Write a protein that binds this ligand. Structure first.
Ligand SMILES: [Ca+2]
Ligand SMILES: [Ca+2]
Ligand SMILES: [Ca+2]
Ligand SMILES: [Ca+2]
Ligand SMILES: [Ca+2]
Ligand SMILES: [Ca+2]
Ligand SMILES: [Ca+2]
Ligand SMILES: [Ca+2]
Ligand SMILES: [Ca+2]
Ligand SMILES: [Ca+2]
Ligand SMILES: [Ca+2]
Ligand SMILES: [Ca+2]
Ligand SMILES: [Ca+2]
Ligand SMILES: [Ca+2]
Ligand SMILES: [Ca+2]
Ligand SMILES: [Ca+2]
Ligand SMILES: [Ca+2]
Ligand SMILES: [Ca+2]
Ligand SMILES: [Ca+2]
Ligand SMILES: [Ca+2]
Ligand SMILES: [Ca+2]
Ligand SMILES: [Ca+2]
Ligand SMILES: [Ca+2]
Ligand SMILES: [Ca+2]
Ligand SMILES: [Ca+2]
Ligand SMILES: [Ca+2]
Ligand SMILES: [Ca+2]
Ligand SMILES: [Ca+2]
Ligand SMILES: [Ca+2]
Ligand SMILES: [Ca+2]
Ligand SMILES: [Ca+2]
Ligand SMILES: [Ca+2]
Ligand SMILES: [Ca+2]
Ligand SMILES: [Ca+2]
Ligand SMILES: [Ca+2]
Ligand SMILES: [Ca+2]
Lengths: 4, 312, 314, 316, 315, 4, 4, 305, 4, 4, 309, 4
């Protein structure tokens, strides 16, 4: 999934 | 028919020292993290190493998507400070590390605050707040855009000592060894970033570099004829005379100077007081010009004196 | 016995280089206090101006009465007009010595100045820098004003550079009181005084600068019994009618150069003149007088052609 | 008209010689009274110790108060660790000036000192090389002026050229250095009843003398203004300053990171790598900004970028 | 371990040049007052006589008490018998320093002298050669300090390279020399109201510069051990094997004919310094060294260098 | 106060 | 006496 | 024996006369055909112009190819600026010789020219004589040249009750220093020479000069002889030779005879004679025993109104 | 005929 | 009177 | 610990005796065959000539090839000019060794020569020689003949004061080396100067002086030890080594013992001893603690007349 | 025979  | 005369000035810089305890850091507040933990630093893989207090100088957040949680670390510089806070001197309070690892989107704080506490020897406890905005950016294929931005604030704290006010003040972050002070760090994901945290403490209710002011054309002689500064430079350069740099920042040995065309100057002692010898003098050269167009070069000598806290 | 006339020749290059304007930078020194270098200004002690941004002024010392001592160099660009002639005294610039009283110990002991320019060939430029060295002697000031004088000494430095697959060498000759022709390599300036002097240089072919020259023996074609001959006289010009006595192994000035003739017939001749002073079909003439063992004199002539040649001619 | 970016490059040899320890011997002098040469000792005026039986100390003079004047050289063998970097400042040893009041006329006027070592080159062949070092001395008259009563040593920029792997190299005295500073001098002034220690800096390079690495060119060769207008450089500066464009400093010496540049008004430039090769990174480039001007009066700014390449001696 | 004996060889050109008489002519000078160049005379301050018409005399100054200061050069032609031997000390003439009190500022600060002569070959061709002699002058201020009121001259180590039978040769100044002593000085100090006479030593050799004969090598290259490292611990002139030798490693060690320096790692250089008249026709220079292996065992051997005399036709 |  |  | 230094002195008048512009008239001649005296014109053979109505040109002869032979004199009034300096070479004018091919017998044999001016305003005139030889033309161009000869005439005049004498010195190839009194000019060619004159005090013109004996002051017991002389100070050396030769100094020439007698003539233009001028010579003496000795002869050269 |  |  | 400067002094006599010419007579010998003494003549094997009728030549042997072996002594009268200087190498004569092959058993074994002169006092000096006419074999070095001379003397009075002349030895002319035994090849000769010296006293003794350098030195029960000595001034460096070695100076030799004891012997001819002369040595002392210290030993070398003592 |  999306990471930061 | 005109002659520029030599100007004398002087500025005091306090070159004393405070007896301080060791310092203790606690991450006390924040906004918006998921799974936020503050803790005394551990030798564990993502633990930030150790220090000598029970304070919580580590703070993480986020749900690891690859391994470790992002966060901040602060490791005091107590061993080197030897219970001492020199005045008007860059002080490494500690080393700040930025642990930027990939965390599931939305997991990061947006801001956090850290107290740093110590005493001043009888024993006056004082605390300094440290503010941080945090930007865990969305990670994309652009590694420079996928970086994380911390911003620290120039907070201060003013405290009393021998019936006199002093002010500690955040200056900023420093790539260790480089002299460059920033207020925002950029760390790549899967990486850390260690910076010295530079502070300084001076007299007064805020921290202000020592500084002095005046007019060079005040003692200058011209038939009525109006005068104008047309050059300034560091050092003695009378033989040549000087052109240019009016109203520019002009670096000397201990501080910077700005001379305006009408004679007005300000001079700021920027140097650490460890670099200010006894009987120190900063020399600048100016060149004046009367209305006839006739040049004339003189000197501006400013004593930079080292005074004790008791002195004033 | 009979002395027979002798013939020689020497070539001197009489060409010209296209050169750029020259920029002088004081690059190094030892032992000054408050040493400053700068592009020249009309400030009182500023050394005056020139057409570059190069720093041709250098001062030093802590003035005890007014100004700081130092060196000045103002190029001769305007008058050279982009040309270096060969085998020709060239005023590269005017060197001034600013000697004022400075507090003891305040002066350099040595300093070096570069002189840079380019040299056009066949389109293109060839940058060339000549180092110039100086020993400085700021002397202790006493009531003896000649002793209290300060001494500069310049060096015979050179720079060899290429042009059309051939070497050329610029070379410091020395200092010159303007208008006097006398070359010195040491200056003596009094306190509170300046001293301006042309800086003479020259450029010629080869790996160092050598004055044009020829050599030979006059007694080779001379006729005697065997019988040994001896040169017992030599003179500039034609003096056969008289014949000549003396000046054997003496420097003998001609029109264009100097001659030295030894008693055994050996001569060397050095074209010393600027090539501007060398006419198109020039011949330098000397008279010698020989003596055989019997004691019988005999006078002949030594005619030496001084040929002007282009750099291309060799 | 448009000035176009310009490229150059300069090679600097960044290798090393395996050298023995070095030995100093004062071999000659002129006009001294009671002149003595000796291996250094911890005697009060003995100049200290070193690792050899050479004569690195020299004294002269009939002491008028205590000790004789003289010179000391103490090799830096310990820190050099059998190695001479190329195009690198080398402290060969520490030279001292022992200046003491000696009765007038008692001093030399000149002296010379040998320095010998071997160079191991290839397959352990030892090539012995000696550097001559020349000194003019001026034991000045002593008066009530302590500056005028100082003694002046002058050292000469001597060299020695030697062969290594069928190739010439030249070691060369640079000068004296106040230890811990950066300034090179070739003359010392020392007070009476005082000493003066200075590093002796030398360097060794390829060729028959020592010449800083360097490169030359013209920035306007590539610039465009037609054959109907001539160009002129009007400014140069270290760094990238195209946004500003640059004024001034034509034909002035301009410091970069690794060396100095001089740009002439007609486009001619020379660049001299002055830095120690220890300061030259493996992808070093020295950028300068010039500004050109066509005859119409129209400005234009471009860049001169010079690669500073490190090479081995094998690349000869 | 066993230090084996060493063998080396250095060649010294021991020939001679056919030379004419030499002619001195003072050609240049800077900053004097009333500078006079002249041929030598038996006049009080004329510097004596010689066999040429060249200007071997120079004076300067305004006499404050009697004579002018100046520089003398009187060739050594009568003794040189028309010959310049190679690798040999040669008095080119005697230089006198006439030092008299003169009104301050009136002395030269520099002066150059040319010494000219011919060099005949096997075919008789005369090849003219000239040697420049440069002098720095220090006419110091006269005070009650007699030594500080002395005048200092400095002579340069100039040379002239000339061809002889398709071969280069170089004459080079060595310096001044008190007649009778051997010390060679490059600077003289003379008292006021006093003269100073010194021999001008010069030396001509093969090549483009003048270099004393020399040879090199390594004594440990043939020594035996292991791998066990070896180190020279002593060297000395002569044969001293019975004793073996300690010390003088990296010192200048004087022999009969020249000097040796032996380094701790075996590297030696030997320079023939001697005049070649003092080099016998079967000369050999002997040194003793003592080597040491790592175990600590000493061992003494010899270093024998032939000093060969050659003619200019040989190489 | 010495001059040089 | 006189020193140097 | 010891020779002692000797001191002499000479005076050279270094003042100036206010003079008018000068006017030249060819006034007399012998043996010309078609002789024309005229003020100069810009005509081809007219000799150029000047600031006068006087007749400074003179031609003669019947041209066989083009122009007539003749003489020209163009005053130097513009540069003299109303001044005659004393004991100073003065260019009075430029004399040209116009040598053209003229039928045999056509030439004068002699001619005289007046030069008139005032001196502030005592008017004075200087006569100028010329002998002329128009040679027979042959294939030898050197022999075909015509010779002019000028005479060293003078005129003496009074000024503030004091006598002065102007005097022809000779011809001078302009820009040189050589004075000649005879010219030779190729046919079909011209020849321009400065006419040098000088004016000094007295009834004729005499270079300043002083005399003496250097041995009068020298010491010995009962025979001295001068054996050397030279310009300059050469005592260190002593001097040999040049006794009774003319010895050039800075300002004038010296002749020293073997018995000690010397004469010194200031020849220089006074513009080149500094104030406090001193001319030094060296002599060497010899007594009968054979012992040499060298001294100096220092002669002041003074400037007077 | 003849010239001068 | 100064001498050199 | 501070070594102090030392001051010594030695007197050497630099006067001269007026002497006659000298006359040599071979007076005695042992075991020769056909031994002949005679005044020297320019006969081939006659030993050349001299200025008086003394028998300064001696030969022996039955020559097997040509000449007889023998000795010769030609006096140095022409150069001595009637003068014996004191404390000065004197060439009394040139001794030649004539070694030729003589039939085995033909040589003397012992031979003595008188040398007589007067002193303005007739005095005679005996000169002893042992001789070894070796056996002749194919080893030319073994076949050489050895002479040995003796260090005899004679003491005589002059102005009520005793002087002693003393043989020093043989000298290869022009060298400095003294030997007391000669070796000479068969069919060859050998000429050596005969060096003698004469000084005051009952025998000849080089001038000499003694002292202790540590006597004036300062040290704490601290003991001192000399650890180095050297000729010259070497205080700047200080000195190591050479304790108890013989150390040559300008005029004489020094030996400094580790305990400070020194002796100095003026060896030089007095023609080489200038007025105001001083011989200078450097020592380095050491206290028990181990701290070094360097000083000088300056010894005046005084010239005196015989009248002075 | 034998010599010495
Ligand atoms: Ca992130
Ligand atoms: Ca803590
Ligand atoms: Ca902790
Ligand atoms: Ca913590
Ligand atoms: Ca991010
Ligand atoms: Ca002011
Ligand atoms: Ca001829
Ligand atoms: Ca310029
Ligand atoms: Ca400029
Ligand atoms: Ca400039
Ligand atoms: Ca000064
Ligand atoms: Ca001064
Ligand atoms: Ca470009
Ligand atoms: Ca060493
Ligand atoms: Ca050592
Ligand atoms: Ca050593
Ligand atoms: Ca001193
Ligand atoms: Ca001094
Ligand atoms: Ca000669
Ligand atoms: Ca002569
Ligand atoms: Ca001569
Ligand atoms: Ca003098
Ligand atoms: Ca002096
Ligand atoms: Ca070996
Ligand atoms: Ca006289
Ligand atoms: Ca007129
Ligand atoms: Ca007219
Ligand atoms: Ca007219
Ligand atoms: Ca004609
Ligand atoms: Ca005609
Ligand atoms: Ca006798
Ligand atoms: Ca007899
Ligand atoms: Ca007899
Ligand atoms: Ca035998
Ligand atoms: Ca003692
Ligand atoms: Ca025998």
């Amino acid at each position: 999934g999306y990471t930061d | 028919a005109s002659t520029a005369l030599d100007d004398r000035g002087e500025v005091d810089i306090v070159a004393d020292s405070f007896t301080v305890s060791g310092v203790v850091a606690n991450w006390t507040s924040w906004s918006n993290g998921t799974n936020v933990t503050t803790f005394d630093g551990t030798n564990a893989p993502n633990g930030g190493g150790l220090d000598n207090d029970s304070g919580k100088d580590q703070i993480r957040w986020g749900q690891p998507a690859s391994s470790y949680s992002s966060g901040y670390g602060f490791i005091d510089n107590d061993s080197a400070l030897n219970g001492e806070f020199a005045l008007n001197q860059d002080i490494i309070l500690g080393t700040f590390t930025h642990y930027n690892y990939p965390v599931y989107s939305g997991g990061a704080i947006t801001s956090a605050s850290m107290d740093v506490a110590f005493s001043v020897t009888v024993l006056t406890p004082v605390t300094l707040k440290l503010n941080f905005d945090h930007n865990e950016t969305p990670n994309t294929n652009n590694p420079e855009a996928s970086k994380d931005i911390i911003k620290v604030g120039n907070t201060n704290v003013t405290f009393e000592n021998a019936g006199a006010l002093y002010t500690l003040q955040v200056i900023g972050f420093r790539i260790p060894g480089t002299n460059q002070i920033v207020t925002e760090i950029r760390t790549g994901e899967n990486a850390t970033n260690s910076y010295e945290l530079v502070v300084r403490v001076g007299p007064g209710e805020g921290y202000e570099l020592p500084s002095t002011s005046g007019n060079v054309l005040s003692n200058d002689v011209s038939g009525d004829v109006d005068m104008t500064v047309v050059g300034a430079a560091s050092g003695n350069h009378v033989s040549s005379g000087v052109s240019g740099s009016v109203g520019s920042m002009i670096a000397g040995l201990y501080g910077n100077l700005i001379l305006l065309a009408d004679g007005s100057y300000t001079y700021q002692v920027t140097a650490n007081a460890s670099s200010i010898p006894n009987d120190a003098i900063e020399i600048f050269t100016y060149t004046m010009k009367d209305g006839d167009g006739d040049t004339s070069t003189a000197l501006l000598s400013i004593n930079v004196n080292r005074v004790t806290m008791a002195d004033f």
